[PDB]
């Protein structure tokens, strides 16, 4: 009974919290705004920004670890101190990644990696 009272309170809190959120005039289900509004309830801009930051953080930490451990032995037996060092260092990815992009340290010319299968010779 007490747990159901807590559930009822949660439901009423959800009702009062979604009041400012927009819902269709026929469904009643609140909508998510994906127009880049930045200033409406249920907008997708804030979750997009947060996720993009943390996802770039994850990718940058992984790339940094792979660059600093250029060995297969370091991928099965993780160098945990270096791994956590890269994980902590990944916070500055939006600046470091761009500084590597413009300074020619992220991309590699196509003539240095395997392009793909041959399509001609004769």
């Amino acid at each position: 009974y007490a747990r159901f009272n807590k559930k009822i309170k949660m439901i009423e809190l959800r009702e009062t919290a979604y009041g400012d959120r927009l819902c269709g005039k026929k469904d009643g289900l609140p909508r998510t705004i994906a127009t880049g509004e930045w200033n409406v309830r249920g907008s997708a801009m804030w979750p997009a920004a947060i996720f993009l930051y943390i996802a770039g953080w994850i990718g940058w930490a992984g790339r940094s670890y792979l660059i600093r451990t250029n060995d297969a032995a370091k991928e099965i037996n993780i160098d945990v101190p270096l791994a956590v060092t890269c994980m902590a260092s990944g916070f500055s990815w939006p600046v470091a990644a761009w500084q590597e992009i413009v300074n020619g340290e992220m991309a590699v010319p196509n003539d240095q990696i395997h392009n793909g299968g041959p399509w001609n010779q004769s």
Partner: protein
Amino acid sequence: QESSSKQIRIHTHKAAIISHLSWVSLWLGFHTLAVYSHNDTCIAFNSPSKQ
């Protein structure tokens, strides 16, 4: 290396084409199935308004 034919230019960077097509396919699949799963789970849990 004679990048003259259109098929030649396509084949020069075919890996880029296939990688980006794989990326967009993965994005669409992940974010359609995951949102559908969110809606399914939250509507099975008596919460149509949590979709």
